[PDB]
C-alpha cells in the first residue's frame, strides 16, 4: 500500500521519478520556488507553496517516510498552480500536462 515505509531501494526510484519531472519540457514553472516578481500576490493566495527543488532537498535528506507523503507534496504543486491560475492559463496547462506525466511515472514506480 502507499503507507508502506520507504526503503533505500524505493528512494532510488523516487530520485528517478523526480529527475524525470525536472527534465520535462513543461516543468519549468515548477523547478524552483515561485519568485514574487513572477507572480503577483502569489504568497498571499497560496498558503502552502511547494516546488521541485524543495522536494529534491527533501529526497536527499530522507524527509519522506511513506510514499503518500511524496505524492502529497507533488499534488500541492499542481493544486497550487490550478488555484492560483485560471484554467485559461498556459501555466494552468503546464500543470495539466505534468500531472498526467507524474501519474504515468508513479504507476511505474508502484509496479
Ligand atoms: C503567472 N502565473 C504563474 C507564473 C509562474 C512563473 C513565471 C516565471 C517563472 O520563471 C521565469 C524565469 C525566472 N524568473 C525568476 C524571471 C517561473 C514561474 N508560475 C506559476 S505556477 C508555479 O503556479 O505554475 N504561475
Keywords:
mainly alpha, 111 residues, Bromodomain PHD finger transcription factor, binds ligand 6FI, Histone Acetyltransferase, Chain A
H/I helix tally: 5
What molecules are bound to this protein?
A: the ligand CNc1cc(-c2ccc(OCCCN(C)C)cc2)nc(S(C)(=O)=O)n1
Helical proportion, percent range = 55-70%
Count of domains: 1
SSE run: HHHHH
Largest sheet: none
* CATH superfamily (homologous) name: Bromodomain-like
Task: Report the CATH architecture.
Answer: Up-down Bundle
Tertiary shape: globular
How many beta-strand segments? 0
What is the terminal separation in angstroms? Answer: 11 Å
Q: Nearest-angstrom radius of gyration?
A: 14 Å
CATH topology: Histone Acetyltransferase, Chain A
Subcellular location: Nucleus
Protein name: Bromodomain PHD finger transcription factor
Organism: Homo sapiens (Human)
PDB class: antitumor protein
Describe, in short, the structure shown:
With 111 residues, this protein is mostly helical. The protein contains five helices and no strands. The protein is globular and about 40 Å long.
Per-chain topology:
Blueprint: H1 8-23, H2 42-45, H3 52-60, H4 67-84, H5 90-110
Helix pairs in contact: 1-3, 1-5, 4-5
Description of the molecule:
With 111 residues, this protein is mostly helical. The chain has one domain: Bromodomain-like (Histone Acetyltransferase, Chain A), CATH 1.20.920. 61% of the residues lie in helices and 0% in strands. The protein contains five helices and no strands. Helix 1 (8-23) packs antiparallel against helix 3 (52-60), helix 1 (8-23) runs antiparallel to helix 5 (90-110) and helix 4 packs antiparallel against helix 5. The relative contact order is 0.19. The structure holds the ligand CNc1cc(-c2ccc(OCCCN(C)C)cc2)nc(S(C)(=O)=O)n1. Residues 22-92 form the Bromo domain. It is found in: Nucleus.
Amino acid at each position: 500500500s502507499v503507507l508502506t515505509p520507504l526503503t533505500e531501494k524505493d528512494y532510488e526510484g523516487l530520485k528517478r521519478v523526480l529527475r524525470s519531472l525536472q527534465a520535462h519540457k513543461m516543468a519549468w514553472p515548477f523547478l524552483e520556488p515561485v519568485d514574487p516578481n513572477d507572480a503577483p500576490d502569489y504568497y498571499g493566495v497560496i498558503k502552502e507553496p511547494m516546488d521541485l527543488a524543495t522536494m529534491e532537498e527533501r529526497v536527499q535528506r530522507r524527509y519522506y517516510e511513506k510514499l503518500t507523503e511524496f505524492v502529497a507534496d507533488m499534488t500541492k504543486i499542481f493544486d497550487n498552480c490550478r488555484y492560483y491560475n485560471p484554467s485559461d492559463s498556459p501555466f494552468y496547462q503546464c500543470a495539466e500536462v505534468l500531472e498526467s506525466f507524474f501519474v504515468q511515472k508513479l504507476k511505474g514506480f508502484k509496479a
